[PDB]
Subunit: 115 residues, 5 copies
């Protein structure tokens, strides 16, 4: 008799992974200014295969953000008067039940009964 | 008799991993200023294979953020008067039940009964 | 008889790992200033394989943030009057039950009964 | 009879590891100043394999942050008057139960009964 | 009879390790100043393998932060008047139960009963 359960070469990478973003970006120059936010997310997969005489050239590119200003001149007065930007009055209440569950199970059961 | 449970070459990397971001970015220059935020996330996989005479060139690129200003001139007065930026009045209350659960189990059971 | 449970070559790296970020960035130059934040996260995997006469060149690139200013001139007065930036009045209350659970179990059970 | 439980070559590095960041960065130059924050996180894996006549060149790059200013001139008066930056009045209360649990178990049970 | 439990070549490095950061960085130059924070975290793994005639060149790069100023001139008066930066009034209360638990167990049980 033979009872076999064979699992091999399973790819379960990046399961239930939180790699996002949540930003509150505000920018009030009142003049000549540059603001840059650079938050890339990469979850790709690359596979290459060769045999005997081979040659693999894996040189991928990358992101490029460039800001250039050959000339910029300001004259007379530059002013910026600010009283407030964000006025928030949040008054919550009550009993809030927040439950989160993440599960990942691998259950294997084998049994052999004979005489 | 033979009861076998064979598990081999399982990839379970970066499971339930929190690698995100949560920022509150504010920038009030009132003049000539540069603000840069650089938070990249990389979770990629790269595989290369060769046999006998081979050659692998793994030279990937990278992010590039550049800011250039050949000339910038300011004249007369530059002013920036600020009273407040964020006015928040948060008054929560009550009993809040926050429960989080992350699980990852590998259960294997083998049994053989005979005479 | 033979009861066997064979587990080999399992990759479970970076499981339930908290490598994120949470920042509160504020910048009020009132003039010519540069602010840079550099928080990259790298969780990638790279694999290369060769046999007999081989050559592997693993020279990946890196992030590059550059700020250049050939000329910048300020004239007359530069002023920056600030009263307040953040005004927060937080008044919570009540009994809050916060429970977090992270689990990772490997249970293997083998049994053989015979005469 | 033979009851065997064989576990070999298991990779469980960096499990439930807290290597993140939590910063409160504020910068109020009132003039010409540079502020740089450099907090990179690296959790990658690199594998190379060769046999007989081989050559491995593992020279990865690194992060590079550069700030350059060929010329910067200030004239007349530069002033910066500050009353306050952060005004926080936090008044919590009540009995808060905060419980955290991290577990990692390896349970193996083998038994053989015969006559 | 033979009851065997064989565990070999298990990698469990950096499990439940707290190597993060928590900073409160404030910088109020009121002039020409540079502030640099350099807190990198490295938890990577590198593996190289060769046989018989071989050559391994493991020369990875490193982080590089550079600030340069060819010329910077200040004229007339430079002033910086500060009353306060952080005004915090924290009044907590009540009985707070904070419990943390980190566990890592390796339980192996073997038993053989015969006549």
């Amino acid at each position: 008799g033979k009872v076999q359960i064979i699992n091999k070469k399973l790819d379960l990478s990046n399961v239930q992974s939180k790699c996002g973003s949540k930003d509150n970006i505000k920018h009030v120059p009142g003049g000549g200014s540059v603001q840059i936010v650079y938050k890339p997310v990469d979850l790709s997969k690359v596979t290459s295969k060769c045999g005997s005489l081979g040659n693999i050239h894996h040189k991928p590119g990358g992101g490029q953000v460039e800001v250039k200003s050959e000339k910029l001149d300001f004259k007379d007065r530059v002013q910026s008067k600010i009283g407030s930007l964000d006025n928030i009055t949040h008054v919550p209440g009550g009993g809030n039940k927040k439950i989160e569950t993440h599960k990942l199970t691998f259950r294997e059961n084998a049994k052999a009964k004979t005489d």
